[PDB]
Paper text:
In contrast, the presence of H1 on the stacked nucleosomes 1 and 3 differs between the four arrays. H1 is absent from the stacked nucleosomes of the 4×177 array, but is present on nucleosome 1 in the 4×187 and 4×197 arrays, and is present on both stacked nucleosomes in the 4×207 array. Particularly high Δβ values are found for entry DNA at nucleosome 3, except for the 4×207 array, which is the only array where H1 is observed on nucleosome 3. However, when Δβ was higher, H1 was not bound, likely because a stabilizing contact between loop L1 and linker DNA could not be formed.
Author numbering:
A (entry chain P), B (entry chain L): 20 to 102
C (entry chain O), D (entry chain K): 37 to 133
E (entry chain N), F (entry chain R): 30 to 124
G (entry chain M), H (entry chain Q): 10 to 118
Amino acid sequence: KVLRDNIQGITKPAIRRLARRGGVKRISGLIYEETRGVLKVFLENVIRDAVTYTEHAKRKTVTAMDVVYALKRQGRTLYGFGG
Amino acid sequence: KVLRDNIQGITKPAIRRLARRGGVKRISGLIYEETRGVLKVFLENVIRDAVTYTEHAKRKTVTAMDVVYALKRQGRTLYGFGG
Amino acid sequence: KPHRYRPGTVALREIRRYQKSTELLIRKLPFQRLVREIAQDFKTDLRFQSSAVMALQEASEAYLVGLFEDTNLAAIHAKRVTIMPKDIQLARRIRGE
Amino acid sequence: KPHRYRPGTVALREIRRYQKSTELLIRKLPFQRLVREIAQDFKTDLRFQSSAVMALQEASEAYLVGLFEDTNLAAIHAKRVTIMPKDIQLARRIRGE
Amino acid sequence: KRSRKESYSVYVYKVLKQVHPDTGISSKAMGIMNSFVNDIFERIAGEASRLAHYNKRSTITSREIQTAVRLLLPGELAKHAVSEGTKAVTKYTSA
Amino acid sequence: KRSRKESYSVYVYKVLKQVHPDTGISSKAMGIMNSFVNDIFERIAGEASRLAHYNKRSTITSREIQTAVRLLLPGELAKHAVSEGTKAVTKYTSA
Amino acid sequence: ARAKAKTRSSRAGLQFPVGRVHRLLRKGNYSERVGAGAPVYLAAVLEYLTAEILELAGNAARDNKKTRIIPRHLQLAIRNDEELNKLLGRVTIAQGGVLPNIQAVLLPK
Amino acid sequence: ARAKAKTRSSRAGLQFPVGRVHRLLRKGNYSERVGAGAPVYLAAVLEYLTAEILELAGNAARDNKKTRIIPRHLQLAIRNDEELNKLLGRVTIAQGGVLPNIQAVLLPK
DNA sequence: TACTTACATGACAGGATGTATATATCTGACACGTGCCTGGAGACTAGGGAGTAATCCCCTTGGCGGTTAAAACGCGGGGGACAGCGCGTACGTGCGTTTAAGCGGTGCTAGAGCTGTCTACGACCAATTGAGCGGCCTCGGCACCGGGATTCTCCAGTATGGCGGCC
DNA sequence: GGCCGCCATACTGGAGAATCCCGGTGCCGAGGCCGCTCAATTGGTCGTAGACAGCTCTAGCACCGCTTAAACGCACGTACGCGCTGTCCCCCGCGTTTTAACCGCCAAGGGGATTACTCCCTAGTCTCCAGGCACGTGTCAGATATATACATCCTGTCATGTAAGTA
């Protein structure tokens, strides 16, 4: 029922490709785990707010629009999912 | 009554004092004019907002509440001036 | 002799291609499972719209690429071509986090 | 011989002396003259509440202090103590200026 | 059917045919401009509410909106927005 | 002739002497407190307005405020505030 | 005996719905009364920004020889206008990609 | 002939005004209608928040052997609490200075 | 000692191959036609909010006389920044293998979302009160000041380690 | 090799100025008390918002199956980060001088805010109509495919920096 490790699912070559999109030419092996940690922290910060929206909405299925609300709260407003 | 060179009125030792409050030990010679320019830009933005407030308020005297709101809109909210 | 590129060249080609390309670089389904397992860390048995999963995704990679641009800025400010995590920690402190 | 401290000793004494301090580090009258000077360019004959002048003073001082905090974080990141304006530009541009 | 949800499809399309009669548009980009117009509308609306609070004004007028534009919009964007809105409000004032 | 300006002086004075009977105060410290109470008040009020808009609620209740507390107020302070607020609405309904 | 119901957008000679914006501000909790020229001015500003952005988007589409507006075109247009850039610095475009940005120190000799 | 005047702030047993916070929320144009538990919950939150502010200010003053709160005490009170820091990362304090903060590289040897 | 010259590693000069560059296609999202109802709109109208006049007074602005505080200038000096080269290094790149992601294909009901009720639920007005703010003054905690103690900091005699030379 | 003697380098005590720190004195602003006033509440009332029930139907979830991108892991080529030494220079510290900032004092009036009057405006409501949304449905731009050029970056050769012979 429960899952224990899917932060591994954000794979190392995916991080590598993003750093290519982010413009990194050389990536230490120490980079991947701490990038996983900081994205982990950020996603927790987002999803905690999103869940707070969700039981504020009395719902059990998470919608994208509350994700938009949480991102706009945290100053990382995303275009393409509102409404 | 016109003023021309009061950016030099923010003195070099005042810059040193501020960096001591910032905890800066050693300060290069190129620092001071760059600090003058960036503080000039910051002040220009803030009082541009404040002057916009004041002309929108149909006033002539710059008030500290306008300073407070201008700093709020730049995300630099200040406590201690009647806010 | 089989062909082999000098270091950075494929890195730079990847840089150019994903700066040109716009697609997601992470597999969507492990990301979805990660979303659900951290959801049950706050509330168990939550359900997620797929649009919410990809919206959280493009938000995640955009946040990440912003941090890595700051990381490259610090690293060239650290006079370097290889980034180390202290660049990211520095940038995270600079953003006020 | 007259007493002479080694370079940095008086600097560190200034560090402790101005962190324990709370007073404004700018002379009041030329700062007021400068804000009148710059604001005259945007609108003529502008008058300033003196409290607004000290408000601009303290806000600008703390904004600069936060800037040099970001700067010397970059400097210890850059293994230096003699900060240079590229450090400030790095702090601004990573901050988004 | 379903409930009608308001969107900005047709007005953006009219403006697009004003500026580019020849081109098409993707629906993903269309939702992005819907988010854009809603987001900037929210920014200007909140700013106008702030200034109406500061001036203790119970009514937000085009003076307040112009002030908010001069705040948020940068430079030539602000002044040509002033020009466009001024021309529009003169035409609407002259019906 | 003068006009009254409202400020939160006496309440912060009350709770200070409640928790520290022997402790004095400076007035500009009270200015920083007034700035604090208005700042956090407008943060919570704007977030509550946002939550009322998102869930199509025309009324902002304690659930909205508590939601805004979990959003803006981080962690331990949020749980304490939830605790004394639940106590506070409870004794209020009993009063 | 009422005359023709004319539209306020065409009264302003404009495309954006004046009635929608005025109704939203009446329902948006910003002021209980809204000045008459306020939504007209707002819609004029919105149409001006939207028109210049769509013009840039069409020009960018023509630049990469495409005839349809793409979010990649939106990224490459808005992020390359510096006043639109710092107008929209913290705003994310879905599937917009990134600006082509290589640092000069990263490029070889 | 009339009920005795006993305020809702006394009903909460809390010093922060139920009435004033309620009228500022109603006047602040967030919604035209406000639930009853909203201002009492808000006032409880505010008075509690100010309570730990006053605790930290009191211990800061007791540390610096003054009985009166100075904004330097407020600086030391705010910046030494991680949740208060997360609350007030972008907030500027008048005449507060900074934390006593030196990097280890600045010290001799 | 400089001039020339060799050589070998840094500089000068041309190809495989991944992406760029030429159409062919078939599709389904672009794009356009259609019912509609809801969304905008208009006339009156009741009422409310902002602009305007006066004004005054108090709070800002300019002027002036000294006073060092603050700036300013200059000079000894230690530290700082940092590059050439070196050197252990740390990771990009090749590329085959595994597997679970990806695609695509089914069944179903959880709850998302939409619809009728109904009563909680809370804004609002006249009145009344009580707390809470303007005003003031005043006195004791705190600012300013003088004098040791502490404290820190720079130096210089020194002990000790280390190293060499003679027996 | 031992022994003795000599240099090297930090060990360490000592001393004096800067700042805590202790005691003395005024002063200023906390605070506490007095007078006003407005705001906050209460009772009721009246309109209405959303909570609740409940259906329904639909996409998330679960299950199933074929494919190959993923991925990852080991080898290896190769470039990275930073430090030693040095090196060059750049503000830091430590003064002196000077000047205008500061502080205290004086005169002006600007304008900001306050009250009253006024009148400009804006939404409510009711109804009416039309335009964009929902739906539906053709349809060609491009997604995909196949074939070809050129970068392009790598690879194979120029060149001169520097080492060496010798006039």
